Amino acid sequence: GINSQFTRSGNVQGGDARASEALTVFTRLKEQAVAQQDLADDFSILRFDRDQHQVGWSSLVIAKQISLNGQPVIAVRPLILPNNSIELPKRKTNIVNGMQTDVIESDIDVGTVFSAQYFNRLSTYVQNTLGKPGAKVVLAGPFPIPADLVLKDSELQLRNLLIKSVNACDDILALHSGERPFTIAGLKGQQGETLAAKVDIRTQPLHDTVGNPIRADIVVTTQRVDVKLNQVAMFTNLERTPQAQAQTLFPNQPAPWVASVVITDVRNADGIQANTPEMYWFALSNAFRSTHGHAWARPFLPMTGVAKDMKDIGALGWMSALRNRIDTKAANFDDAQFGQLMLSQVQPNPVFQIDLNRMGETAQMDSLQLDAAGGPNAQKAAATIIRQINNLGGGGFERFFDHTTQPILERTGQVIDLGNWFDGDEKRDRRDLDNLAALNAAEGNENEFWGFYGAQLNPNLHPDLRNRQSRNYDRQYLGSTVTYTGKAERCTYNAKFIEALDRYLAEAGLQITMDN
Amino acid sequence: TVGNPIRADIVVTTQRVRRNGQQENEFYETDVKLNQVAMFTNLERTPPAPWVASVVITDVRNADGIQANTPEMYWFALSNAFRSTHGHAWARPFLPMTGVAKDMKDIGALGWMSALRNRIDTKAANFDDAQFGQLMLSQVQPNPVFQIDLNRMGETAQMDSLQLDAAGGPNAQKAAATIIRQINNLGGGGFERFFDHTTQPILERTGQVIDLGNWFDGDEKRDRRDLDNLAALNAAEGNENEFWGFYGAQLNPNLHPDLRNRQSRNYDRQYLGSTVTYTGKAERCTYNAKFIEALDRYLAEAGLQITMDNTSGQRFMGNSVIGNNMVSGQAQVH
Amino acid sequence: GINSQFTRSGNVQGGDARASEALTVFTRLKEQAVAQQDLADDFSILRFDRDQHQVGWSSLVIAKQISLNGQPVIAVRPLILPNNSIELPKRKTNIVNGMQTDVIESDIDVGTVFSAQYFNRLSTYVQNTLGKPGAKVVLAGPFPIPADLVLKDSELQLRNLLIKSVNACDDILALHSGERPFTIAGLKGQQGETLAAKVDIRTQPLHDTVGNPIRADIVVTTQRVDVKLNQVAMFTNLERTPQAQAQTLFPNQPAPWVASVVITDVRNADGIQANTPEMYWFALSNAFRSTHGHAWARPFLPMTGVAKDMKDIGALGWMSALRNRIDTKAANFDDAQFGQLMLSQVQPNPVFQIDLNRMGETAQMDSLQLDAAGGPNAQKAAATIIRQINNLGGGGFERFFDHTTQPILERTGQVIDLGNWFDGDEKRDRRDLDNLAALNAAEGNENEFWGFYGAQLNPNLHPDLRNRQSRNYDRQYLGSTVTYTGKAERCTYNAKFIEALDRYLAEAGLQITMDN
């Protein structure tokens, strides 16, 4: 280089600030926890400087270091530490318009940093540090640390994150060890303590293990008889089919909207500690129950005296045979008239989809879902998912349908970015923009709403341009204080998949009763 | 280096680009930044387009990767600073950004000084990119003059003293000789041919005694340079005899500079928060119009492959070239 | 191929229809003309079948076959015969929009067919036919035969075309022989028969030697004292500078339009026979005189009781501080108020430009003008043009200005296609669309007029797309019966060029008086 050309008698800056603080606080928390017998000291925490290995983001790893069957095996869980001080170079793409060309520069998320080369470098680093070059390396699901967090004032959440990380490492190591899978037959016993569902509606968002908010309008949960089993949090979105609008301009001698349910959080119970595929599917089975009594339409019911311009059903007036916002806030806000309005505005059957996260708290399990919907490793993922479902059920799940005949889920080629925004006192998830809220904010102006919808969905537009337009529209609404954390891909389950999974669970034993 | 802030909204960064296939380093910044220059845009006025654009170079420090501060780095940074008139990049900060109404930076203030006494609905939907590109051709001359704030007690004070002396004084000739020697000791292509020093001066002081302070709002600090002419126009609205009063307090020949400095301090206390504090004093100067062009031509002929991109809805607006040939005057044949 | 694969006992079609008829009628006309002593029989007419030499359009040549200085030299004038029966393959271009790409297919004109390979093939064909391989080949300017013409009913015009073709061949052969150039001093003599100009306004278009109409609103002509010298036909067009509209939306404490004069026909007198560069420049010198008394504004003066919606000045009302079409057809149509309107709507100084034709009746001379404005052969063209002007004048024309210092003319990167359309009884030139007529037809609708103007002029659009949009807008207006013949490039002279040419002619002798 040129710094060594002159050999000046001075060294400025270090190039690493947050990693040292994180290592110190993590060592302090580990020592405090092991002092009072909270965690076994068998596991170790390491450090991975970004400069010393030519990597984008410095991420510290958690390792268990337990062998198996006489051969060495290592299980590692990453923990990325993005830093605002260091800004890695952006990504440039070229778009041709007319005769001219333009360059769009887009920021680099945390998902794109965790490349295969990064995994290989971390694997070789941990192999060299732990002195077992022949060990087998597995991952329990990398999880970023949000940059807004302050290290000196995050005791409880950091301790909980460490505990969950070591639990996940132990769980993946045990799964490689091949324990006994938990079938539904274990739940049922001599006592007639049948399971139950207490679906509930929420307004304030749920919180991650760190503090990142995630939007959740309806939650479905499983109880015994004190004891909880599952909790699936998800909200409702509306989409417009091209044929419905066609039957509005050019009529002919259905409904103008379709209802979509987006699963966001699929975590198991707080009380339970282990995390296994059978837990994941037993929890996901509850994501279909919300359709009982059309309960998924509960958020669309008018709020108790609260305007909430991001959830006004009057936007349906802007897109209908009639015009103007519907004055639902009058004395005619009764639940019955809302019932006929829903009967004649949206179809009575929903569609299920999930914003699968490549770097969520269950990113290891979401990765299987992404591979099951496309890419080179597709058939093997289908075999794994079907065999996991069979192990859960214990019966002939292949009879209900064949994986090779119909796809498990479709990719749909959409990207949803996760973030948070500040309003009033409590922050909310970025994913509150939706389409109904955008239509309410636009208060008409067909062109603006159609442009926003195209910005979210356009097969003929470059993905980077679509992301930039979505970011611009996000900044336009709900203020200009949005902060982005990660990226997720939205994929829709096939109807037959759930329609057979719930039936198979019922055949194999489903002792749940709900009232609505 | 210290916690003092510097007003800077346009940063021109020059760095090396690896063309070895981009391998064994995915999304790794390494250390490729050569040097950066930080500058803003100021709008002066004349007694065509009335408003004349001006670019004031504020920060000239080189990248943290290098640890040696030599004159050649300084002149490389000055050469870099010129690479902003390409694509009218100096007009980018004047472009409104959707979603923010922070004020005291909007372009609509020029409307107060136009034929009509109104502010253009800048944030509205009717103000698009094509309309903005009109407001510019209609209003500001499309050639930016180059200024620079020499700091007597700044980071590059031992180097800024050379230009301050070359502005004119007892050591002006020696300063010109040494600055010519320094710039020629960068490429060795004979700077005498491209641009001499005895023929015309290199930089002229404008007489402004602009000074560096600090003012706090919104739970952060910022530099006192944020109050330019456009900010004063926005803050004081379309009223007259107070914007011209501010411009005169900024500079007038027919009064002692102490009174105008006191008036400028009073105005700074008035428009922005009274919590402002003052740190040091600088001196504004204007570079020669063709000296920078000669420097850029030198750097080009010596050999520096520098690549640009981007640059500035798209419906057609006039030929812009037919006006060249007017063939004024008939034959007047008897 | 596959036709010879089966060797069927049948041969269908010939692939050439119009060439045989043209050869027969041309032989008949040549024999009739030479019978009564009209043309010397030294020249010969040939035939060039399109199939026998792998060429696009079959073109018949006219050759003189006269040697010079003891070495053989041949002068040939082509004559292209486009046929509607045979449609040559189109030209495909690709335009990228967003992520998608589209292909635009454009027709092939007559200008693009006459490639250098075509010239070489014709040269070798005439060398082989005439038995002089070492002869030097020169061209007198190829000229197409319009497809709408019927061969059996075109006696007079075809005979005149043949006579003009042989005259042009003789003229180019003589110019290569190096005769005495005709300076202005030859015109002046003992008699005080000073030259004069009788600029006149026209409505019906002038006609070519075949019948193709060319728009001509003002003509400037040179007379003696029965005897005519020159006739330059040209019309007026209006263009909008970007600064004028800027001073309308965003004002500040000139004129909204600029006047352009487009020279179309630069032919010499009908009576005179020779065609030489001195004739061309002596005629072009008259193209500046029209500015006397602002006479070029005469077409803008309201017509005598005729609406003529393609020439209404009321379009200026649509583009002004006021609104709506100006009711000029009222009792306030006096010439004075039109004078103040012109004083305050357009600048009092015009700009000159010419729609140079690569395949016009003077295409050989227009080619020099195209090379003078760009391309590789640029400086040599400037030397030739300046030396021709000097030979015309006989004095130091280099003193007035230097060609190497300022360009003679600018290309401007515009293409104007020539054609004709049918209305009422008499057809008119395609070039009547203009901009003022388009604005009148649009009767407002800022977007439509701006889109049309951009379709004519857009540096950021592909030339093929611009041509297609211009064709579509042409078909939209003035009916859907437009027929295209050739393509021309519009180039604007520099002001100094004419401002010095007229002055140099005045210094060298300019005895012309006009009254207006």
Cα gap A467→A448, rounded to integer Å: 17
* φ/ψ of residue C233, rounded to 5: -110, 130
Cα gap A71→C281, rounded to integer Å: 98
The helix-helix angle for C379-393 and C277-284 (nearest 10°) equals 80
* φ/ψ of residue B272, rounded to 5: -105, 180
- CA of A459, closest CA in chain C: separation in Å? 9
Q: What is the radius of gyration, based on Cα positions, of chain B?
A: 22
Are the C-beta atoms of residues B58 and B283 closer than 8 Å to each other? no
Yes or no, beta carbons of B318 and C240 under 8 Å apart = yes
Host H or E run for residue C385: helix C379-393
- Token pair, residue A198, equals 């207490």
Q: Is A100 on the interface with C (CB under 8 A)?
A: yes
Discontinuities after residues in chain B (C–N over 2.5 A) = 47, 312
Find, in chain C, the residue whose alpha carbon is nearest to that of A463.
Answer: C99
- Token pair, residue A127, equals 């192999």
**Residue whose entry in the numeric block shows the structure tokens 């333009």:** A102
**Residue whose entry in the numeric block shows the structure tokens 């909880």:** A228
Cα gap A370→A373, rounded to integer Å: 6
- CA of B99, closest CA in chain A: separation in Å? 5
Q: Of B110, B311, B333, which to mutate for an interface test with C (greatest number of C Cβ within 10 Å)?
A: B333
Tell me which chain B residues have a C-beta less than 8 angstroms from the C-beta of C250.
111, 114, 120, 134-135, 138-139
**Residue whose entry in the numeric block shows the structure tokens 């050019």:** A250
Distances (CA, A) of B226 to A136, B232, B248: 58, 10, 18
- CA of A22, closest CA in chain B: separation in Å? 21
- Token pair, residue C500, equals 């010095």
Give the C window 432-461 contacts with A, CB below 8 Å. Answer: 460-461
**Residue whose entry in the numeric block shows the structure tokens 């010095």:** C500
**CA angle, A146 as apex, A143 and A148 as ends, to 5°?**
170
Are the C-beta atoms of residues C254 and C242 closer than 8 Å to each other? no
- CA of A358, closest CA in chain C: separation in Å? 26
From the DSSP assignment, how many helices (H) and strands (E) are in chain A?
A: 14, 20
Strands (E), C64-223: 73-80, 91-97, 100-106, 136-139, 143-144, 195-197, 200-201, 206-207, 213-214, 218-223
Host H or E run for residue A25: helix A18-35
Q: Of C95, C99, C460, which has the smallest distance from its Cβ to A461's Cβ?
A: C99
Q: CA B191 from chain center: how many Å?
A: 25
Per DSSP, the residues of B257-283 read: HHHHHHHHHHHHHHHS-TT-EEEEEEE
- Token pair, residue C149, equals 């013409």
Cα gap C233→C267, rounded to integer Å: 8
Three-state DSSP at C172 gives helix
Distances (CA, A) of C302 to A445, B21, C316, C332, C339: 45, 70, 13, 11, 11
Q: Is C251 on the interface with A (CB under 8 A)?
A: no
Q: Is C69 on the interface with A (CB under 8 A)?
A: no
**CA angle, C450 as apex, C448 and C452 as ends, to 5°?**
70
Q: Of C94, C96, C99, which to mutate for an interface test with A (greatest number of A Cβ within 10 Å)?
A: C99
CB atoms within 10 A of CB A338: 17
Cα gap A437→A395, rounded to integer Å: 45
Tell me which chain B residues have a C-beta less than 8 angstroms from the C-beta of A468.
none
Q: Of B135, B319, B333, which has the smallest distance from its Cβ to C241's Cβ?
A: B319
CB atoms within 10 A of CB C483: 13
Q: Of C100, C460, C462, which has the smallest distance from its Cβ to A460's Cβ?
A: C100
The DSSP call for residue A204 is S
Per DSSP, the residues of A368-407 read: HHHHHTSSSS-HHHHHHHHHHHHHHH-S-GGGT--TTTS-
- Count the residues in chain B: 334
Q: Is A101 on the interface with C (CB under 8 A)?
A: no
Q: Of B25, B98, B309, which has the smallest distance from its Cβ to A472's Cβ?
A: B98
Cα gap A504→A509, rounded to integer Å: 8
- Count the residues in chain C: 516
Q: Is A98 on the interface with C (CB under 8 A)?
A: yes
Are the C-beta atoms of residues C94 and C84 closer than 8 Å to each other? no
- Token pair, residue A46, equals 């390491």
Report the sign of the C-alpha dihedral through residues C403, C406, C408, C410, in that order.
positive
Amino acid at C217: D
Yes or no, beta carbons of A95 and C97 under 8 Å apart = no
- Token pair, residue A396, equals 């002939």
Per DSSP, the residues of A282-337 read: HHHGGGGGGGGGGGGGGGGSPPSS---TTS-TTHHHHSSSS-S---TTSTT--HHH
- Token pair, residue C269, equals 């007198």
Yes or no, beta carbons of C454 and B315 under 8 Å apart = yes
Q: CA C466 from chain center: how many Å?
A: 20
Cα gap A55→A36, rounded to integer Å: 37
CB atoms within 10 A of CB A515: 8
Q: Of C260, C291, C451, which has the smallest distance from its Cβ to B322's Cβ?
A: C260
Tell me which chain B residues have a C-beta less than 8 angstroms from the C-beta of A8.
67-68
Q: Of B134, B321, B324, which has the smallest distance from its Cβ to C246's Cβ?
A: B134
Q: Which own/partner pairs from A327-330 qualify as long-range (CB within 8 Å, at least 24 positions apart)?
A: A328/A302, A329/A302
Find, in chain C, the residue whose alpha carbon is nearest to that of B328.
Answer: C349
- CA of C95, closest CA in chain A: separation in Å? 7
Cα gap A166→A172, rounded to integer Å: 10
Amino acid at C291: T
Cα gap A246→A256, rounded to integer Å: 10
Report the sign of the C-alpha dihedral through residues A263, A264, A266, A270, in that order.
negative
Residue B100, C-beta contacts closer than 8 angstroms, at least 6 positions apart? A480
**Residue whose entry in the numeric block shows the structure tokens 């230097």:** C402
Yes or no, beta carbons of B68 and A56 under 8 Å apart = no
**Residue whose entry in the numeric block shows the structure tokens 């603080």:** A21
Yes or no, beta carbons of C502 and B316 under 8 Å apart = no
Yes or no, beta carbons of A97 and C95 under 8 Å apart = no
Residue C50, C-beta contacts closer than 8 angstroms, at least 6 positions apart? C15, C16, C19, C56, C57, C58, C86
Amino acid at A40: A
Q: Of B24, B25, B29, B73, which to mutate for an interface test with A (greatest number of A Cβ within 10 Å)?
A: B29
- Token pair, residue A103, equals 């360059």
Provide the number of CB pairs (under 8 Å) joining chain A to chain B.
52
**By C-alpha distance, which of A273, A277, A276, A283 is closest to A221?**
A283
* φ/ψ of residue C97, rounded to 5: -125, 125
Q: CA C280 from chain center: how many Å?
A: 13
Yes or no, beta carbons of A96 and C96 under 8 Å apart = yes
CB atoms within 10 A of CB B23: 8
* Residue C196 bridge partners (DSSP): C223, C513
Per DSSP, the residues of A43-103 read: SEE----SGGGT-SS-EEEEE----BTTB-EEEEEEEE---SSS----EEEEEEETTEEEE
Resolution of the coordinates, Å: 4.1
Are the C-beta atoms of residues A429 and A215 closer than 8 Å to each other? yes
* Residue A356 bridge partners (DSSP): A489
Cα gap B149→A433, rounded to integer Å: 46
Q: Of C98, C100, C460, which has the smallest distance from its Cβ to A99's Cβ?
A: C460
Tell me which chain A residues have a C-beta less than 8 angstroms from the C-beta of B31.
1, 3
Tell me which chain A residues have a C-beta less than 8 angstroms from the C-beta of B309.
92, 103
Three-state DSSP at A490 gives strand
Yes or no, beta carbons of B29 and A89 under 8 Å apart = yes
**By C-alpha distance, which of B299, B312, B301 is closest to B14?**
B299
- Token pair, residue C236, equals 């007026």
Yes or no, beta carbons of A56 and B31 under 8 Å apart = no
Are the C-beta atoms of residues A161 and A209 closer than 8 Å to each other? yes
**Residue whose entry in the numeric block shows the structure tokens 């009058």:** A330
Q: How many CA atoms lie within 13 A of B29 on its CB side?
A: 18
Three-state DSSP at A154 gives coil
A131: left (phi over 0), alpha (psi -120 to 50) or beta: left
Distances (CA, A) of A216 to A415, A424, A429: 19, 19, 9
Are the C-beta atoms of residues A189 and A285 closer than 8 Å to each other? no
Cα gap B57→B78, rounded to integer Å: 9
**Residue whose entry in the numeric block shows the structure tokens 């007003």:** B7
Cα gap A395→A393, rounded to integer Å: 5
Exposure string over B151-175, b if 16+ CB within 10 A, otherwise e: beebebeebbebbbbbbeeeeeeeb
Residue C249, C-beta contacts closer than 8 angstroms, at least 6 positions apart? B131, B134, B138
Cα gap C286→C282, rounded to integer Å: 7
Q: Of A99, A460, A462, which has the smallest distance from its Cβ to C462's Cβ?
A: A99
- Token pair, residue C361, equals 């009746």
Solving technique = cryo-EM
